[PDB]
């Protein structure tokens, strides 16, 4: 059967028995920068399997009235070992990513998730002509949470699920590489993003590459007696990462 999938990277392994199908990107597999498109001149550091491995983010609890979560991935992987350190000592960096989102339930549960990778998700502010603080955009490994009604916290992102922060219809977000975690039949939110930017290498702290979003369209709903605590765990692995421009320790 094709419901079984094993993913091996570095020294970590994820096995799923109720997978559906692994999505890979816009058709492109991640690969190192060729020397016909390169700009920087010194020798890049393709480190080892020391960074190309799975890192586990924190878990969020999916309740009956939860709305959505998001992360910022060149910034969310800032303290995960040698990826975080090679981020903090280099000026340029470049990497693809393999995101594996877990969530499980029983056969008596119902509910549906949407897992999108949105490149260049430029968030909008809550009050209109006002600056946004860096902590309200990206909180490291900690997820920021959408709301149902419009929000008006000062220096905060406008966080309504029916606009997804950017200002589009949320039913139109299926144009990006995505899957669905239907609790009837899925656990395989696997999305192999290639590197997507308009420069061949870029800074990790100053630029956010993309944004993972987990938006439940058909809400979690269960009968009385089932397990009410259903966690969601996001696991992410960088792929084909390389670094360039070594200098002293960066901006924490």
């Amino acid at each position: 059967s094709d419901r079984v999938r094993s993913i091996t990277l570095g020294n970590s392994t994820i096995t799923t028995q109720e997978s559906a199908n692994v999505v890979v990107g816009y058709g492109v597999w991640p690969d190192y920068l060729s020397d016909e498109e390169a700009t920087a001149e010194d020798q890049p550091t393709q480190p080892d399997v020391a960074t190309c491995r799975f890192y586990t983010l924190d878990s969020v609890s999916w309740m009956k009235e939860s709305q959505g979560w998001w992360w910022k991935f060149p910034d969310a992987l800032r303290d995960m070992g040698l990826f975080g350190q090679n981020m903090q000592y280099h000026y340029l960096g470049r990497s693809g990513y393999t995101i594996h989102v877990q969530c499980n339930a029983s056969k008596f549960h119902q509910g549906c998730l949407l897992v999108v990778c949105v490149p260049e998700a430029e968030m909008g502010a809550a009050n209109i002509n006002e600056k946004i603080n860096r902590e309200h955009l990206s909180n490291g490994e900690v997820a920021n949470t959408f709301s149902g009604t419009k929000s008006s916290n000062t220096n905060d992102v406008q966080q309504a699920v029916f606009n997804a922060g950017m200002g589009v219809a949320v039913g139109n977000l299926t144009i990006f590489p995505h899957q669905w975690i239907n609790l009837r039949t899925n656990n395989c939110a696997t999305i192999v993003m290639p590197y997507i930017n308009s420069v061949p290498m870029d800074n990790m702290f100053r630029h956010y590459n993309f944004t993972l979003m987990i938006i439940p369209f058909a809400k979690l709903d269960y009968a009385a007696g089932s397990s009410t605590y259903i966690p969601i765990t996001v696991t992410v692995a960088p792929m084909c990462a390389e670094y360039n421009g070594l200098r002293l320790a960066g901006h924490q």
Binding site: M63, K64, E65, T145, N153, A224, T228, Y229
Partner: peptide, 21 residues
């Protein structure tokens, strides 16, 4: 016997602390 979610958490709405449910 428990009914409903076990845990509620703290949220900030209109710069004011508030529990979620």
């Amino acid at each position: 016997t428990m009914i409903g979610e076990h845990s509620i958490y703290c949220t900030v709405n209109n710069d004011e602390g508030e529990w979620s449910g």
